RNA sequence: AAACUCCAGUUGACACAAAAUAGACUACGAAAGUGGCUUUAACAUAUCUGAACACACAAUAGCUAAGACCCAAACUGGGAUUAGAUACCCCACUAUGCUUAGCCCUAAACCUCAACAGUUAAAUCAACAAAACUGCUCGCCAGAACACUACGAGCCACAGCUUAAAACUCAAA
């Protein structure tokens, strides 16, 4: 996971933000904000690592780098939940989801089906 | 409608169930 | 000044009184109007009982405690004996939709009692005990 | 319980009228729907069967209050004939 | 064409929605003087919209804001306070004849 | 601007050094949450 | 985020009040929370009779902390708070000046609702 | 109802026929047995009000229809 | 019609006229009628803005003797 | 203002489960129905225990009673003349609310109109 | 009538139970379900369709083990009724309803109306019900009864569940 001192997606763009106050650096830190916060910064890490426009959230690659993280908040939520059979759903859908996806890019773009799996450190299966 | 279908299979799984408790 | 339904809260100043007395010192007479039997208690503001009367305790038995004339008959018992003690005002608070809620109430009222208030307390839980299964009739 | 007494479901009595406070009393408890709740509590309404009497009161509120609203609307109309003969 | 012709455009007569006495304004589980105006002074119960006039938005701020100020210790449950029956009335019911 | 509101605001924030100060300052002042409602939609701040 | 710890102390002087409330601030900052402001309500009569600590109360200190705190603090402050002998009830909430109120339009009225049953003749 | 007094006079005057009232069943389509066999029907109907007093269209644009009469609506 | 803009104006303005509409005469001409006419007249000399086509309205009407009750 | 109708019921279009279930089709009948009888409230019954009160301690003898006998005969003469005359007239002049024949003959001219025309 | 009479009423202290009013609202969830308060996490998918069996769920009742127990309550016992009363009515009390950990896998699980896309014109349409249709796909159906059965197979299920026939019979259902 990112640092707890890193900063929100939306003020680590703002000009001047490294001279401000230490107190204003934590209230807009990651230590100071919800678990969906966090989420942002590890989908913005992945982009860049992977996609070559990072700004292009429509293409199949952000949709399956976006989709990824949804499924590690799942896997990490059902550690705590493993009783939370809604959660339980919501995760074994977006594992066949993301398997659609990963089935759609490998046929329409191998070299970029080949990043994404090493990127998000993948391993494809064909269905039985 | 009428439930004399339902009343049917009502009496049909009663006795069903007494035979088998009776062996 | 206009009259107010609403009772006096006691810490404020209020002018209303009863003999000297302030709302928050005139004895209480508890009736619980119970489906077969009313049963009538009058304490005084410290909860010191001061008399006791209900069907049962008035020579009715099986369904006739259950009627009004038999509340109006503990009604006049207790105020009977309440009345020897010195009770003249009366708040009255009552609990349960029983045959003798009103009934009682003019018992005390036919026993020498003035009533002043009426307050209602009738048990209701907010989500409780599930109570009895539904008769078929 | 845990409450102040002689505030809740409290009337005071004027000038001795007993009656008319115990009718005040009544209609405070029915209008805020405290004694068809007394009563509706006596023995247990199973869930299913709630469902069912909200239901039809649901549905009878909006007829009578439609037709309320069909006769206020409609009783202007029973004037006299203004046309007698024709 | 013709210059009398009718011309396509909105209702200009058109009156303004209407909005409850709330609309516009925060509703605070604090402000118990606020949440009493929409109990019943006799037995506490929150009025329904047909009797409060708030709409839908409001009608739940309300509620909600009455149960959670009720059980945290802000405002009593089986009676309206004492101190705000001289409180303007704004809702639409008589208990008295 | 948010960032530059923020700045402002900490200045009058609570610390371990004001701690002592600030409780009593506390103790002397009165929050009133309280208003009604009118009819037409007025806010009725209280008396005091 | 930012939270809103409603606090009501029990019935002291001065002095203990005092340090009831640098107690409870402190024990926020133990636990990582920014302290942004301390609302005093008054003192007044609780709305219901409370029992806490072996005690019965009927008056009370109306206090407020807004504070800012990680997720993780909460649960850790509600547990110390129960444990503190001055403190009748104490509730953390969610600020609720951070909840933007949408706007609104206003009333839009509902017709009457058509065609619920077919217009064949009954 | 209203008008009934002024089309009955209208009728009278220009020569023609009015018909006001309540309209019985079988005027047109039963005339034979309710007037004669020898009757002789309008041979064109003008409705100044299609509607009968349920805001219903009047029986007998349908019954003129049936008897093949033509008619005038407003 | 465009001058109905103008006519829910005048009425939210100035009110409905206490002068009573006489809708038997086929030539009836009320108060925001006249307002009409000379907002139209005005408009076609060039002015474009509205809020201050209206004002100028306004006062061209007192000139001329009509009463014009503000509402508000 | 009555309630909604909208979504309310089990239709084609309206995805949620049904939240009225009517038994009878909710459309305005052309009648209303007739006012059930009621049953009144004993009069001089206060005066009637009055009387059988002094008899329980006088032996049942009507010589001591007399002005308890008396007023619950004026009572029951007065109670039979009002009688007489709330016939005349809350039967007759439909004081109030219309009586439902009155306002069945109302409704008669006014149908609703469930079909098309 | 039986039952209780360490009983009842007022007052105070006092839940491993259940959640008035709001709700005349019609929201959330895949369905089952979900209406006391707070906080944390959190409600898949940028084409659609796609399974008795794969995968994951699934009211109530029920099973196994350990706890809690106000109230309710199969069974059982007592009282009464009756020609009889293994019922309906009254009283008492248990399994059970709750928690924890595993099972069981059913419902008139029905809003008896499959998912997705589209239409209100034509012939509007057997009847009733909740107007009539088009495109596309999956599932399912072919007289009644035998039959929520037999047999086989699978299953933590051993008086169970799922899948599911035939012979004899009738001319109707
Ligand atoms: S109408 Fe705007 S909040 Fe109620
Ligand atoms: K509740
Ligand atoms: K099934
Ligand atoms: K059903
Ligand atoms: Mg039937
Ligand atoms: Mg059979
Ligand atoms: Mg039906
Ligand atoms: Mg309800
Ligand atoms: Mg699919
Ligand atoms: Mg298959
Ligand atoms: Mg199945
Ligand atoms: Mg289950
Ligand atoms: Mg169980
Ligand atoms: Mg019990
Ligand atoms: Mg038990
Ligand atoms: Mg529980
Ligand atoms: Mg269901
Ligand atoms: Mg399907
Ligand atoms: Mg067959
Ligand atoms: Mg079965
Ligand atoms: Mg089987
Ligand atoms: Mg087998």
Redesign the interface.
């Given at each position: 996971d990112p640092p707890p001192s890193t900063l929100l997606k939306d003020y680590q763009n703002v000009p001047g933000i490294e001279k401000v106050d230490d107190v204003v650096k934590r209230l807009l830190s990651l230590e100071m904000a919800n678990k969906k916060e966090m989420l942002k910064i590890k989908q913005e890490q992945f982009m860049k690592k992977i996609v070559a426009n990072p700004e292009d959230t429509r293409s199949l690659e952000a949709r399956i780098i976006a989709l990824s993280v949804k499924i590690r908040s799942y896997e990490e939520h059902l550690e705590k939940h493993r009783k939370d059979k809604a959660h339980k759903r919501y995760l074994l859908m977006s594992i066949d989801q993301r398997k659609k996806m990963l089935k759609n890019l490998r046929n329409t773009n191998y070299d970029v089906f080949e990043k994404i799996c090493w990127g998000l450190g993948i391993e494809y299966t064909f269905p039985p | 409608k009428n439930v004399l279908k339902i009343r049917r299979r009502k009496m049909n799984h009663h006795k069903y169930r007494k035979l088998v408790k009776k062996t | 000044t206009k009259?107010?339904?609403?009772?006096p809260?006691?810490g404020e100043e209020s002018s209303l009184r009863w003999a000297g007395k302030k709302?928050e010192e005139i004895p209480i007479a508890h009736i619980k109007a119970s489906h077969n039997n009313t049963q009538i208690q009058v304490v005084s503001a410290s909860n010191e009982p001061l008399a006791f009367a209900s069907c049962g305790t008035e020579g009715f038995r099986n369904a006739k405690k259950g009627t009004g004339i038999a509340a109006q008959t503990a009604g006049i018992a207790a105020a009977a004996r309440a009345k020897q003690k010195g009770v003249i005002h009366i708040?009255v608070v009552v609990k349960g939709?029983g045959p003798g809620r009103?009934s009682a109430?003019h018992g005390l009222?036919m026993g020498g009692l003035?009533?002043?208030?009426?307050?209602?307390?009738?048990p209701?839980?907010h989500x409780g005990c599930?109570?009895?299964?539904?008769?078929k009739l | 319980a845990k409450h102040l007494k002689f505030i809740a479901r409290t009337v005071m009595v004027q000038e001795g009228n007993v009656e008319s406070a115990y009718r005040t009393l009544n209609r405070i408890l029915t209008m805020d729907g405290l004694i068809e709740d007394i009563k509706h509590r006596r023995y247990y309404e199973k869930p299913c069967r709630r469902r069912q009497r909200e239901s039809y009161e649901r549905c009878r509120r909006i007829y009578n209050m439609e037709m309320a609203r069909k006769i206020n609307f409609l009783m202007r109309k029973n004037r006299a004939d203004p046309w007698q003969g024709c | 064409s013709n210059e009398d012709l009718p011309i396509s455009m909105e209702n200009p007569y058109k009156e303004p929605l209407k909005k409850c006495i709330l609309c516009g304004k925060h509703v605070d589980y604090k402000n118990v003087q606020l949440l009493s105006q929409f109990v019943s002074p006799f037995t506490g119960c929150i009025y329904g919209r047909h009797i409060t006039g708030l709409c839908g938005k409001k009608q739940k701020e309300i509620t909600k804001a009455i149960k959670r100020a009720q059980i945290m210790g802000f405002m009593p449950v089986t009676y309206k306070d004492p101190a705000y029956l001289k409180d303007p009335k704004v809702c639409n019911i008589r208990y008295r004849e | 601007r948010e960032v530059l509101q923020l700045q402002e605001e900490v200045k009058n924030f609570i610390t371990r050094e004001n701690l002592e100060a600030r409780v009593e300052a506390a103790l002397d002042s009165r929050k009133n949450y309280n208003w009604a409602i009118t009819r037409e939609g007025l806010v009725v701040r209280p008396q005091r | 985020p930012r939270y809103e710890l409603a606090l009501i102390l029990k019935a002291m002087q001065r002095p203990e009040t005092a340090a009831t409330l640098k107690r409870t601030i402190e024990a926020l900052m133990d636990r990582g929370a920014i302290v942004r402001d301390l609302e005093n309500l008054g003192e007044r009569a609780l709305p219901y009779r409370i029992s806490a600590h072996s005690q019965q109360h009927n008056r009370g200190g109306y206090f407020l902390v807004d504070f800012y705190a990680p997720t993780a603090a909460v649960e850790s402050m509600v547990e110390h708070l129960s444990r503190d002998i001055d403190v009748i009830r104490g509730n953390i909430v969610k600020h609720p000046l951070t909840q933007e109120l949408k706007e609104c339009e206003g009333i839009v009225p509902v017709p009457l609702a058509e065609k619920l049953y077919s217009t064949k003749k009954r | 109802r209203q008008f009934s007094y002024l089309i009955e006079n209208m009728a009278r005057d220009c020569g023609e026929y009015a018909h006001t009232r309540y309209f019985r069943g079988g005027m047109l389509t039963n005339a034979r047995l309710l007037f004669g066999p020898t009757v002789r029907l309008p041979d064109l109907i003008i409705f100044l009000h299609t509607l009968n007093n349920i805001f219903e269209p009047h029986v007998a644009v349908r019954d003129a229809a049936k008897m093949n009469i033509p008619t005038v609506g407003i | 019609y465009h001058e109905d803009r103008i006519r829910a104006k005048f009425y939210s303005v100035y009110g409905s006229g206490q002068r009573a509409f006489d809708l038997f005469n086929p030539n009836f001409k009320s108060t925001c009628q006249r307002f009409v006419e000379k907002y139209t007249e005005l408009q076609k000399l060039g002015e474009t803005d509205e809020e201050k086509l209206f004002v100028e309205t306004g006062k061209a009407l007192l000139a001329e003797g009509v009463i014009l009750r503000r509402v508000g | 203002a009555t309630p909604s109708l909208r979504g309310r019921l089990a239709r084609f279009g309206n995805p949620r489960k049904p939240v009225l279930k009517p038994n009878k089709p909710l459309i305005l009948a052309n009648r209303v129905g007739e006012r059930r009888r009621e049953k009144g409230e004993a009069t001089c019954i206060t005066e009637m225990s009055v009387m059988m009160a002094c008899w329980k301690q006088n032996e049942f003898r009507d010589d001591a009673c007399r002005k308890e006998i008396q007023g619950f005969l004026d009572c029951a003469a007065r109670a039979q003349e009002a009688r007489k005359m709330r016939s005349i007239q809350e039967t007759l002049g439909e004081s109030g609310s219309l009586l439902p024949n009155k306002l069945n003959k109302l409704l008669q001219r006014f149908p609703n109109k469930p079909y098309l025309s």
């Open positions: - | - | 009259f107010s339904i609403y009772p809260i006691p709302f708040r939709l009103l109430m009222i003035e009533v002043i208030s009426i307050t209602d307390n009738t209701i839980p599930r109570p009895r299964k539904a008769r | - | - | - | - | - | - | -």
